[model samples]
Target: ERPDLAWLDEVTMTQLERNPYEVYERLRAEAPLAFVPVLGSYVASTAEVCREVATSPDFEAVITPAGGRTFGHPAIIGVNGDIHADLRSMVEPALQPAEVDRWIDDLVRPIARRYLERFENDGHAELVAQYCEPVSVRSLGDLLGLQEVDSDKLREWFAKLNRSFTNAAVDENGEFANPEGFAEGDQAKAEIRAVVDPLIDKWIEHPDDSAISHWLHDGMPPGQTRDREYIYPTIYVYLLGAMQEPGHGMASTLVGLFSRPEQLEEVVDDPTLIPRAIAEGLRWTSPIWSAAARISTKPVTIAGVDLPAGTPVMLSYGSANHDTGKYEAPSQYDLHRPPLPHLAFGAGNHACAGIYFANHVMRIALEELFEAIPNLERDTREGVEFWGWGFRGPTSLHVTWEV
Candidate 1:
């Protein structure tokens, strides 16, 4: 039992659940690739280790109790070889170079406007729950042709579902074990299926002009050997994950602005830097803290440590983005980082499909937020409360801003 990993695991989880970038920094320095017996996995903290483990085909992402793993849920993460490539190629067209610009213009800005209008009286809002989560949910729904009003329900369902994936106890692991929570997660899955499967049926029957329809029909090219049922479940996972995953990004950005009033002032003064600020927010906070689990297909050594087949590993995106090996003073929050490659979205085969979409949504959300209330500030002496470590964000990120 690698008890040495216990403290790191607890601290990392605490930091992840509560936006503890400072804690992550200390752990990254001390234990770059620490082994956790509780999780039966290796946690990679440094940039090099993260990149190596994630990008290498040697470390496959198909470790489960049943053994037959699918990396892309049902799309890209679960599959390896030619099938994964084909699905990725087909889906690539949906997230085109111009789509983000169009989404920013059409979807995100309008949504932000609607929310800001609600809080115009007070000039203050719980941005994460009220604004950010809704924006992400609605944007994704609009793109996928689902109902925007379902955002709240979707958030609840996704929270339950995503927990099963991230929290070790929810799965078979002993750490943070919650069999009942796992059962509830399973119930959440059933609820999602009940709601979404009908929509999938409608899309299949009607074949609408939406991404979900396109995914079902053209992305798989129809008549493929792959099971069609997986598509809706896959969509459910992605939509739910996308909605709540960036909570940390939103909250951390607020914290960043509160701490660095100068930079906030600069951006408020010159609005063009909002995109850069969004990128920096993502880099600095790294909403999705840990890379999803991957395991070795064959015996391989990494970070001067040797591991055999079936060893589970987690790539810590927070540590890698702050890696001194790659960036100067990796701790500092700089909006101008020269467009560096980041693991905010995982790398290689499992790279997030909604990268551009996420960036577009966040950029518009923040810009429109500033437009609505320019002088927002955190009431931080009271402190902020956050959600799950597996999925980071403030449960209630209270603040008060000028009207």
Candidate 2:
């Protein structure tokens, strides 16, 4: 039972982890769905194959937090069919676009203003850790009903959850095969629940405006029990998901603009263009580079190669966003490209629920932070690097502004 392998010589942990975007280019031209042993899955590098894996019913998601052994409990992403829809519906009301307006002005802007208080005077900071990350943690914490948890603690727990899921894989039984490999994540998962579970209980008794409250008292799929077990894991997932991506996303967005001085000037000259820049930012660097736990349901030919049933799939969204055919001059980060269907937040049923909220954080950070610290510039004297395949963003965004 063997399939023709592709690009194994160039696909190593070192290259995939370091120069992933570069390796993706080679795989796309050679075999978009090449089998790579280093990652323990077939790499889908083209937009077409990545979209096919995402939207087609013939494929199933492997990164289920609810059902997997990785996380002790489950969330909306862990199950499919009616149950997933059931869980998704319970929280969508609060996260939906119109509903987000209910909180952004009150919660997010204040956090933005507060976080900026730290950087405004110094006119210099590593944007990722000092400003962008805390803003993401605190804003998401405020929304998830965990306002009581210290932002630093929340950031650590969020990081642990990421550690738990990075390069997540499963055995033939569809159970998390090597959870022991990431013990820190397991510990972090437990810690997050310690903080989240109580809040879930608190909100159920006295429903409030937070997403946790909405999921507790809002919609219920017909004939469902509405048990706390059903949603606790979801809150756990949101606790992490809501923070890491947007945090890195904001950092990457700034790097993209700052590196392109003209583009940075354009956005700075008119903050109104922040929305378009945010959209491009999501497309450009894609906070998380690839999704590694999808499996083919039936025998399928993707990008002219056959993957027998159940072949593990790793969709390189980082690669898809840079497909030369789909996006001209794929290497360049141009926010002005003709409106295109980018796969940053992902595609189909499993796309991010917090997309609007995430962008709102980035947009406010730019409009407010940039407006306050307009002259803050990327430290060109210090070399900058964007790294990682599973998670990708600027390593250090050293910058200075005249006070």
Candidate 3:
């Protein structure tokens, strides 16, 4: 019998869908280690167990299993050990802290300026659609080397792929739960490959400053070839990261700080606090709620919970970030909360490679926005709405500001 584990029979999809934090609270309070049938994996809610699953050698990461076939090839997130390290090196040169520092003033700032420029005179806008979405799409294109594909296509393709992946989970029949979405995303896979493959060939012959070029020439390990099999899937790995995290993070940060107006004022007044606000925003909402499921290498116990060998565990970063045992008021946006490496980026080997890139881009975007729209505040006429758990953010941020 599975008496050692708590089956979450009382939990409902309604609560998990619209308001997951509520479910997370009860799970942690009652049984931190439990299994959810709908999710089909052991759900670990506490920070301690969640962190250990990612960091410990006993458990291995599973990147994005739901949409692995759509991606067509494995990226760094799927593998471990030396293979993981080598794949990680491929994109680090372009996305690591020092690289972002070199290019932010020249590359990232200009794109943000142009995107935000349109909203300057209007004094009112739905930020996610009008601003954040566009900026993120464009920024990712340039960062990844956008000579062939453009930003508009980036937005379209990303949406299709995300749709496919987010809804990839299946019903009892084993057909994709959202067949329409999977079909669209599967098409996007081929569409992106049409553009990506040629770029790989071109860059292989002649290297440049972009992430693709880095992977083609300098980044690949000694035995690896400058070929599509190695480079293609990894590109989309960053593609999802660059296109999703900062924008979703940006939208959430606006809600967190802007809703509290005073905190927004404080950050705008003192840019130093932007980092803290970044932590708060990511910790609060955690755009990539959970990914990279881990499989136990051996029968092990964590936080006094036992597991048989090869147990598949889905650790919720959304829940881990909200562990009340660790955070005073995990749900509330406490900007001054002490930093302890929140699980927002996921932890250990599979932590976001674009962690620095995402943070810096988001910080600069905020800096530019507050500087341009001095009295920025969310519009009260239309309510702010958030959707999707696989990839979550403010769907629409209707806001009013001084002209």
Candidate 4:
């Protein structure tokens, strides 16, 4: 039996989709530990509670029975305990801050410039489809040593893979389920595997500087031998994180900056300020609006509420980032705000491994944009519209500037 929370009845998917922060605000104020029946999980809406759930070892990241089915294997997103730690160890070095720094000029800048070149001359373009998506896809490909593949094919496969994962979050009734998405999601996973498997095999035989080669040579435990099945899911999870989130992060950062003239002008004037602007924008928009799902391994009490074993917990990163108690003028997009640790990259063991790389890419993308079009501004006629309930960003950011 589920707890009867009145707020859950009033909330609709439509409302949550359009703007979750409004609902998050109400939940945080009234019922910080509210059990949302639709999501079949306890919603952690406050910064303290969200952080507690995120960092606590009592909560496991694995979704169990359904996760393997939905993703076609136990991807890193649904692994817990030692296995999670081992796999994370395998991929960390490839995404380490130092390695990502090396990628800036050689990989990130050139990709950003190449994509921007397509629309820089037109003075008008849909930033999401033309710029953000392509840059993210190409960057991931380059990092994975798939630069030889067609960019268009990589983009298509990534889009399908992203949709497949997003679909797993909810069922037809809008409740959390393992195999919740359309059948096409399963097909998409197969398609992505088909393209990626050969590359993995090739990398295993002749390793390179790419993440794939690093994982092939050094990812497994000391005694463990190569296992393609295990490696496939891990790579899928990496691709999902690498290819999807950065685009939204970059797009939302730009939207947040362009929406404010003073901030935009400050960055444009002093390019050094770009990193600060990106950090603030991540905190403000929270591209990944929600934290990854965590399931309780044992009974625990949080925010004056008892959660039994197996209870699903959903941390609202969007709400946590905007908590009034933690951040002064929490909603304002101020690039110069005093530095505070934000939950944009999550906390504890499950923290985003690619955070450093993501931030570097975003900084470069913005620098390149401003360098090419010094006076770029949002085309208010089209109007920037931010969407996505699970993952958030400006889906359509139509903009114009003098060529």
Candidate 5:
């Protein structure tokens, strides 16, 4: 009894993978509440609808069409109620405020200092691959006590896992070059697991104060023991997921710097503004996935459209953040936008747990950069390729600097 939802059927994976928001914008006006037959789901295109569905317990996260069994590993985003609460309580402490405060001085600033030094010497570099990606990867490695892990091997594993998560649908001709076959994907997973699984076991047995080990041994709530074996794969996923989105955030922040040279000047003159700049950067150009999935426990109405039970819904942050109702010109990147309510870190129960840490890292890194390399500028914007809508980031961002 599924209605002919041609929008779902007509929009190929390539289009969705490349520039989903562009398509979503058109659909928001035409069929803001269309029932997509291909996925047997509904697409919610407006800010209000997305917010309502994301916060409501009636609209659970895991049951959605998108939350397939494979993807729904330890704490896949957008779950609800007590389960969410318990997991948050257990995991949140590991990313403690004190620990993050220490990271600014101990981890982030050092890496930023090194990157800026490289920028000064090279005079030109591919910012994304050379600087931003390594900064994130190494910082996360430091967090997990895997700093000594081979950087080349780490890059290989992290890149594959990132491709897997970001392109869940396996769309062809997209940012995520579709895995030619499942065997290849499995092999990639195995290779990553081989390295991480053993490390996790060792950490568990001889517990350490580092984030990964802390989480490995102490993840269970109250009187519980985390399955030592299962947690390894979870950590593997976390490490990969951790780096990619944050790297995108770093790239977006760099984009803001290039566009608003004045803002860069402001930060350079007074590094205190770095925190505000980081917050505004995240708000203005959030680089996380554009949309996350949700499903209705019962019938619900939003944006004048009633969705039936079990309908899969798409919550578009890109639309929400840029909604005319929210900001004067939501699309424009204004560093001095007075910190409005942004869904960049999402909201309600499913909010990003590591937001505080991410903010600290970004702000401190930028502050260090400004101090170390004040003359950084864009070299060429030519080879910079963007990964469509779902994940917003540059595949490459070339920049130059003067010592």
Candidate 6:
């Protein structure tokens, strides 16, 4: 039987931008494992298939379709097998729940309040720029011991790098589609290395509790050297991992809550429900829509579709999160929804190492913002829209409240 290929050719940026979930739903029901010509890979749309593909040893995480090594060198996102595990082990301890928990009041909370205070008196504010972005970047800077680094430069590097990554995933027409994004991403990397290399060196001599210090003294992983050349890529990946997602997640969560006043009021009335709200928010608006591409190590069968060896599989984290098989009325954002495991932080061996930190920052940011402005409401004129297909979130969340 011929699979429904109706949506395959229509997966352009415009279509994805307008409504990717419509396409995702079609694929989920009609072509669960269909190959998307635009993506140059078979997409796993259902939750079961996505989880299977992600956890199966048959698939290895590497964006070969996007010309592997998008970051110019092996970062934790791309590497697989032993090397990936080794590098992950070095960075994991610093991001563990206990370590991140210690940072909430001292680091994350203060940062969130500081950013919120900036726009509190203005009566209106763009949360993404004034609050979310700064809190996420500054908190991560403190974690990485890059507190002295210029905030504006750090944000610029992150924005450029994110564009590069987004463009790389969607650019199927060879080099010309988005050369500027690729170039900007490359330049951002160089700038990031220039900033982080010296910091790593400083941590080497006088260690601190920062993540860079942890990586420096964690003892060189077997088969990996602990030098500037190798260390730079690791730090680059860490920086990328740290900066953007928390802000995106926080902003999206706010949009999600504010969009539904009853739900927003419920959480506002009872602060204890904030964590549940955060969990639902992560599920409702996953920061990364698609998990990193996984290449088939061998011929594999997913959802009865046969994929040959070396076939790239894109697991739809967003689609899977919205899979009816996994959640009741999956589209609605309900704070009281029963807890179910979500792929918002991903799963398997390559799951997000900074999830604890991301969650901590998100919770603190929301708690501080709402507490500071209890009457916070969306400034409907400016509007709020969540963007990005592969990496999804609100680019701007405008809101206002009584002074």
Best by TM-score: 6
Identify the runs in model 5 with alpha carbons over 4 angstroms from their true place: 1-9, 35-41, 63-72, 78-83, 168-185, 219-224, 381-383
Assess candidate 1 and give its TM-score to the true structure.
0.87
What tens digits encode model 4's per-residue C-alpha lDDT throughout 279-378?
8888888876763667889999988888899888777787888888889987778887898889888887787888888888787887898898888888
Order of candidates by TM-score, top first? 6, 3, 4, 2, 1, 5
* Over 4 Å off, model 6: 1-3, 67-69, 169-176, 221-225
| Candidates 5 and 6 compared by TM-score, better number | 6
Please give the CA lDDT of all the candidate structures. Answer: 0.67, 0.75, 0.75, 0.75, 0.64, 0.76
Question: Each candidate's TM vs. the true structure?
Answer: 0.87, 0.90, 0.92, 0.91, 0.85, 0.92
**How does candidate 3 fare on TM-score?**
0.92
Q: For residues 1-403, could you state the per-residue lDDT of candidate 1 as single tens digits? A: 3455457455444345556466556657766777644344577888888888888979876433211111135445556677667666646666886866654578778877887787756855677778877777777777777764377886786666666666553223544544454665667767766776777777777787677777777744455323456564456456556776655576667666666778888887787887777777777767676636578899998876788987877777766888877888766677656878777787877778878777777777878877777777777766766455445555666667765
- Angstrom error of the Cα, residue 391, model 2: value is 2.1
Clash number by candidate, in order: 8, 2, 0, 0, 1, 0
Our model 5 lands, by Cα RMSD against the true structure, at 3.9
User: Which residue pairs in model 5 clash with each other?
Assistant: 18-388
Candidate with the greatest lDDT versus the true structure = 6
Error of 2 at 260 (Å): 0.8
- In terms of TM-score, which candidate is stronger, 2 or 4? 4
The per-residue C-alpha lDDT of model 6 at residue 291 equals 38
**51 Cα displacement, candidate 4 (Å):** 0.7
lDDT tens digits, residue span 310-399, model 6? 887887788889998779987888887889899888778888888877887888888888888889889888867777766788878878
Per-residue lDDT tens digits for candidate 2, residues 313-376, read 8778888888887888867778788878888887888777778877888888778888788887
List clashing residue pairs in candidate 1.
17-389, 70-78, 71-77, 71-78, 72-76, 72-77, 72-78, 169-177
What tens-digit string does per-residue lDDT give for candidate 5 at 1-403?
2344444656765666566666666666666666543334566666676678788877886533222322344454644567566556656775778867764578877877776676557667787776677777777778777877755566666666544444434233322233342343356667766776777767756777777676655645554456655344445445555666666677777777677889878778888887777666666556654546677899888766776887677665666666665677655667788777777777666767787777776676666666666777776656556674444667887877764
